[PDB]
């Protein structure tokens, strides 16, 4: 019936990376995203109006707080127009990176918008793993989560400790490492593995592209050819969509 001062402080703290890390927790807002992600994440706390709570299966072993219609969700939400349901989930026990089929690596893709779009594209085409390298946006930040369209239900995201070490390691096991560059083989001419076969595809920011140290680990450079009326770069999420589509078309 009332959130305690401690609960409100806890909920509000999760908008900061510092506290997500300390608490090993992150929040998700609204029935659509909470409903979709409940089966896949460990729910610690679920706060909502009665009408919202009845629509989701009560999480096993969570603190569930039913709030009145009058409760102002701006007290706890990060959203300009809050929805009356907020869940707190455990941050996944940070995994070893795994390659299962085509696997995206985002090298320094800092923009939260771009990362969210990429997650949705990965989900659309059935990418199972998205790795996040040095300087990439935090996928569990509210900005990414709220723009994810449920993608975190099915796309496992992996912040990397050492991108180069990881690439070198998988590369030496004979997993092909593709990279999107402005100079390289046309993606239409490159023979590609089936979507279900192990492969890593590295994407950098349009601002700086793939860093030199990461580029050194790439086995196969791919380019999306330009063909305009004058003989720079495509937005990284756009390039990702083009690459994934083509990988799937051939599968």
Automatic annotation (TrEMBL):
Q: Which Pfam families match?
A: MRM3-like_sub_bind, SpoU_methylase
The record's keywords, sorted A to Z, are: Methyltransferase, Transferase
Q: What is this protein called?
A: RNA methyltransferase, TrmH family
Q: Residue limits of the tRNA/rRNA methyltransferase SpoU type domain?
A: 102-244
Which residue range or ranges hold the MRM3-like substrate binding domain?
A: 6-87
Example GO biological process term?
methylation
List the molecular function annotations (GO) for this entry. RNA binding; RNA methyltransferase activity
- Which residue stretches, if any, does this entry annotate as coiled coil? none
The entry sums up its family as follows: Belongs to the class IV-like SAM-binding methyltransferase superfamily. RNA methyltransferase TrmH family.
Keyword Methyltransferase assigned = yes
Origin species: Porphyromonas gingivalis (strain ATCC BAA-308 / W83)
């Amino acid at each position: 019936a009332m959130l305690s001062a401690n609960q409100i402080k806890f909920l509000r703290s999760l908008r900061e990376r510092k506290y997500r890390l300390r608490e090993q927790a992150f929040a998700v807002e609204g029935p659509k995203l909470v409903g979709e992600m409940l089966p896949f994440y460990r729910c610690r706390m679920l706060v909502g109006t009665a009408a919202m709570l009845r629509a989701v299966s009560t999480p096993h072993d969570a603190e569930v707080v039913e709030l009145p219609e009058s409760f102002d969700f701006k007290r706890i939400s990060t959203q300009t127009t809050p929805q009356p349901l907020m869940a707190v989930f455990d941050l996944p026990a940070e995994p070893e990176p795994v390659v299962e089929g085509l696997t995206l690596l985002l090298d320094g893709v800092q923009d939260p918008g771009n990362v969210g779009t990429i997650l949705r594209t990965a989900d659309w085409f059935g990418i199972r793993h998205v790795w996040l390298g040095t300087g990439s946006a935090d996928v569990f930040s509210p900005k990414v989560v709220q723009a994810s369209m449920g993608a975190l239900a099915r796309v496992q995201p992996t912040p990397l400790k050492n991108t180069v070490d990881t690439l070198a390691y998988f590369r030496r096991q004979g997993i092909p490492v593709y990279g999107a560059f402005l100079d390289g083989q046309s993606l239409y001419e490159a023979p590609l593995p089936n979507f279900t076969e192990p492969a890593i595809l590295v994407l950098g920011s349009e601002g700086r592209g793939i860093s030199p140290e990461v580029a050194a680990e790439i086995t196969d450079r791919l380019t999306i050819p330009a063909s305009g009326l004058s003989v720079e770069s495509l937005n990284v999420a756009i390039a990702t969509a083009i690459l994934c589509s083509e990988w799937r078309r051939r599968s």
